[PDB]
């Protein structure tokens, strides 16, 4: 059931061939800092999307700078290249505008 077991499976039985699979899974993490109100936690686990890109949220830790409110969100499994100035609305609890 763990990743890299597939890679062991397809070697042994189905063909000899290699495998690669991606869900919203484990993977490398990136650092992104976002400013909004309404960012109250439990967004971790949701799917953030911007106009350009889509992604998920591992860790919500807050950053410190004067003005607004700025959190540094730990993001993984990113695809679609989110860029500065985007409006970054979450899929659910919609209420996220940032």
């Amino acid at each position: 059931g763990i990743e890299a077991s597939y890679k062991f499976l397809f070697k042994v039985l189905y063909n000899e061939e290699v495998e690669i699979e991606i869900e919203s899974g484990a993977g490398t993490e990136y650092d992104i800092i976002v400013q909004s109100d309404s960012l109250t936690e439990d967004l971790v686990g949701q799917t953030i999307y911007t106009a350009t890109g889509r992604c998920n949220v591992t860790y919500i830790e807050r950053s410190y700078s004067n003005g607004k409110l700025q959190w540094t969100v730990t993001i993984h499994n990113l695809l679609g290249r989110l860029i500065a100035g985007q409006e970054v609305k979450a899929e659910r609890l919609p209420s996220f505008e940032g």
């Binding site: 109100d37 309404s38 960012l39 109250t40 936690e41 439990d42 919500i60 807050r62 409110l69 959190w71 609890l93 209420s95």
Partner: protein, 51 residues
């Protein structure tokens, strides 16, 4: 669970004579990201008094 009387037996056992003690407890949950709250939450059980 944290019992007021179960801690007061250890604070009573500090030194030979403390001749007992009393306390009043304030329940406090610090929550990062004020201004919003997580749409449901800051739930601390054991219903608190009025105001």
């Amino acid at each position: 669970s944290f019992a007021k009387s179960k801690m007061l037996t250890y604070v009573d056992d500090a030194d030979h004579s403390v001749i007992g003690s009393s306390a009043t407890i304030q329940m406090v949950r610090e929550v990062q990201n004020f201004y919003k709250t997580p749409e449901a939450g800051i739930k601390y059980n054991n219903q608190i008094k009025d105001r």
